[PDB]
């Protein structure tokens, strides 16, 4: 056991290691997402542009719980990046829906791993979780219900005019 | 023969005669689709600025051959810049269209002109196609489907306000 | 007949296209002129520079002709750009000697515009063709016989040091 | 088919893919090795600075891929990113040659990519390889060979004052 | 064996040491003119320092070829510089006229290095030589031409005016 | 014999000529010795700077002989450069010492060369030896004296530590 290590419970440790996994997996879906839009048949430079900001922002999530896992003492196990469930992303609608859908997954394990901190009387894991990722997955989440709802009321995903200007005149 | 001729083919001499003529003739398209947007029945400016800008740069494009001939030892020997197939591009996306299917038939030469130099074992041509000409087409190419992809979604070219949203937020 | 049509007569109209080639045509025989003087075999650089600044200049004396038709409500019709009588034009005073002769050509052909627009009584046509056109042709002439003369007095064609020269200390 | 497709064959297009797979391959195991150097138990910073770097480097690699495909009309497949053969690197120096055994390793693939290219007579891929690529593997092995070269004559792995060191005279 | 090395063959290592050697040989001839040009009997100072700087220019081709060879895990052997077949290089044309020579010798052994790159499939070194010497020699010869033209057509070698007017405007 | 030439003993311009060979040879050497450095099984970045440098600054020395040849009326002869007697420099250590061994030999010529000069009478060549060059060479084998004397209390050439601190700590 780490020199360092204190007060940091084994099924904790445990659990950082998969949200680190799962980061690195809507990390991934992201870059899905990204490259569909750069398609030549697709071709809406925005919602590209909006979906690789959001893959590098869950890498920058991803380094900060591998921070956590290092001075708290634990070691770090990494597991595959599983690829996303789809190749095709339909529409800009549809991968709004499909994004805000994830972020709803990965806050539901987050708070699983904050109730884990609580219990096993770790509040410095605690206050991490509340500090650096309660309120950025309200705020995400938010922010794709937001976009989620212009685009339904535009027309999208069958008005193609829709997702243009959207793509235009708020990711752009 | 030249003083600073050294491994140029008769063939690759005339080939390249050929595209100068071609990306002149590819200039000249350019800039008929470029005065037909500039008609006070279409007055689409970015349209036109768009390809106008095109032929401009093809003209970059047949100046870089003639130089390449000149530093071969070659010989240039110019023929008649022909007039387009259309004296009225008819709409935005149609011209989109005509203007990828021109630049598909241009780098088809492209590729044949480079495996004419692969053929007469001359690195320098065949380095000079790639370097200049190859990644060129592929970008411009992409371009043309990007645009193309767009116009379809909104509309066009039954909508005439789906050309005029076009002109004013990707080319403008 | 176009909505901004007014006091444009169909012989203007297809006198203008005629214009429109000449200068095309003009500008593709600058553009053989420069060409030829980067051969390795007469590699006279400010020659080159000298007639491809006036192939370029050309393009805008075809552009402004093509505005003119836009703005007035005629329709543009392209003609093939018609190759240079030569291929290759023996010396820089021979060069310097064809395009005198092929500015005073398009000379007479813009004084044969201009009487059209004065006999059809289109004083806006009239004032274009002076304003943009005959005293810019009374200038080219007469630097192109400023440049004749002093090769002729130097002795060229037959003197090479006097081409030399001349390349160095009028053209560069 | 890709209305911008044109000479990119099916067997290039899952190489690309393959190519994709593997830059993002070698970018999770940079990561690994990155945080390794973070433990508390080994504290080497510098180390962890080195490879940090070179997994952003790899995503690069691989975002460069991806625009490759896209622009030549292929369609990304994505497959899983498995995880490094090691959770523990033992050492500055072993790290060092278990990148560069993987970077030999890519470098290999990125051959017979080329290979492929050349056989599939597509001279824009087999360019795109040799000018991002190929020249980029051989800095690459060529400076791990000479970091590997350095600890052993410094005395690493067992003189811990080597590799203390060489991550502060080298890598800082 | 190099712990770098891959994909390079024993053939091409051999070959580029003979480059090397030709680099640096070119570098001595042009050291040779250059000097010619300072005797109190010739004292054409840019002739001088134009060769001077073609003796620098060749140094940095064979260090980029040694560069090449370190980076490949290939083995450097050098051979002695041999001295020019000429002390006393006549005139200013005379010395282009063996300049130009001399670069058409050395362009066709970095040709003859690119076939036996084509056929080791060594397409970095392929790619090595296309980017940084084939187009380097065509421009290289290019003006040397340029240069022996211009010389010529003045009235050198005869003409010592025309050697001294030379020295001032073309290469001043 | 040379309008310019006084004072200037065929004995003396043959001896200006034998020392312009010999500081090209040293130059050589150095050449040598930096791109041993750069091996990937050396990987001595500083030192293979440091005889880089010693490389250019012998090829500095050549010219200036060169000059004094050309301003006293001599007629340069040059003759082959030697490739040096190793392929192989073993270490660090090695090439100081064998650097110092070719500046004593270098300096011992000089030596000879200014006792020529006050033989024949030649205060001018006598002041340039010692201005230019006598020096010089104390400076250059003091230098060398002192990195060999530094590299043996730390233990080189079998400490590897030792050549690796040297390079960062003295050559760096
Ligand atoms: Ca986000
Ligand atoms: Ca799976
Ligand atoms: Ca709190
Ligand atoms: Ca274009
Ligand atoms: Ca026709
Ligand atoms: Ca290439
Ligand atoms: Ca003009
Ligand atoms: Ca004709
Ligand atoms: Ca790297
Ligand atoms: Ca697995
Ligand atoms: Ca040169
Ligand atoms: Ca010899
Ligand atoms: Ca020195
Ligand atoms: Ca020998
Ligand atoms: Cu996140
Ligand atoms: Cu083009
Ligand atoms: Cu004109
Ligand atoms: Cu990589
Ligand atoms: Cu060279
Ligand atoms: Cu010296």
Same mark, same amino acid.
């Given at each position: 056991?780490?020199?360092?290590?204190?007060?940091?419970?084994?099924?904790?440790?445990?659990?950082?290691?998969?949200?680190?996994?799962?980061?690195?997996?809507?990390?991934?879906?992201?870059?899905?997402?990204?490259?569909?839009?750069?398609?030549? &048949?697709?071709?809406?430079?925005?919602? #590209?542009?909006?979906?690789?900001?959001?893959?590098?922002? %869950?890498?920058?999530? +991803?380094? /900060?719980?591998?921070?956590?896992?290092?001075?708290?003492?634990?070691?770090?196990?990494?597991?595959?990046?599983?690829?996303?469930?789809?190749?095709?992303?339909?529409?800009?609608?549809?991968?709004?829906?499909?994004?805000?859908?994830?972020?709803?997954?990965?806050?539901?394990?987050?708070?699983?791993?904050?109730?884990?901190?609580? &219990?096993?009387?770790?509040?410095?894991? #605690?206050?991490?979780?509340?500090?650096?990722?309660?309120? %950025?997955?309200?705020? +995400?989440? /938010?922010?794709?219900?937001?976009?989620?709802?212009?685009?339904?009321?535009?027309?999208?995903?069958?008005?193609?005019?829709?997702?243009?200007?959207?793509?235009?005149?708020?990711?752009?």
């Amino acid at each position: 056991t780490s020199q360092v290590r204190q007060n940091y419970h084994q099924d904790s440790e445990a659990a950082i290691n998969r949200q680190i996994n799962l980061e690195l997996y809507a990390s991934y879906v992201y870059l899905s997402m990204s490259e569909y839009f750069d398609r030549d &048949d697709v071709a809406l430079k925005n919602f #590209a542009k909006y979906f690789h900001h959001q893959s590098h922002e %869950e890498h920058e999530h +991803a380094h /900060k719980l591998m921070k956590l896992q290092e001075q708290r003492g634990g070691r770090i196990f990494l597991q595959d990046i599983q690829k996303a469930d789809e190749d095709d992303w339909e529409s800009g609608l549809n991968a709004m829906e499909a994004a805000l859908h994830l972020e709803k997954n990965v806050n539901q394990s987050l708070l699983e791993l904050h109730k884990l901190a609580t &219990d096993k009387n770790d509040p410095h894991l #605690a206050d991490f979780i509340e500090t650096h990722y309660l309120n %950025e997955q309200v705020k +995400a989440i /938010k922010e794709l219900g937001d976009h989620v709802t212009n685009l339904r009321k535009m027309g999208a995903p069958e008005s193609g005019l829709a997702e243009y200007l959207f793509d235009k005149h708020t990711l752009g």
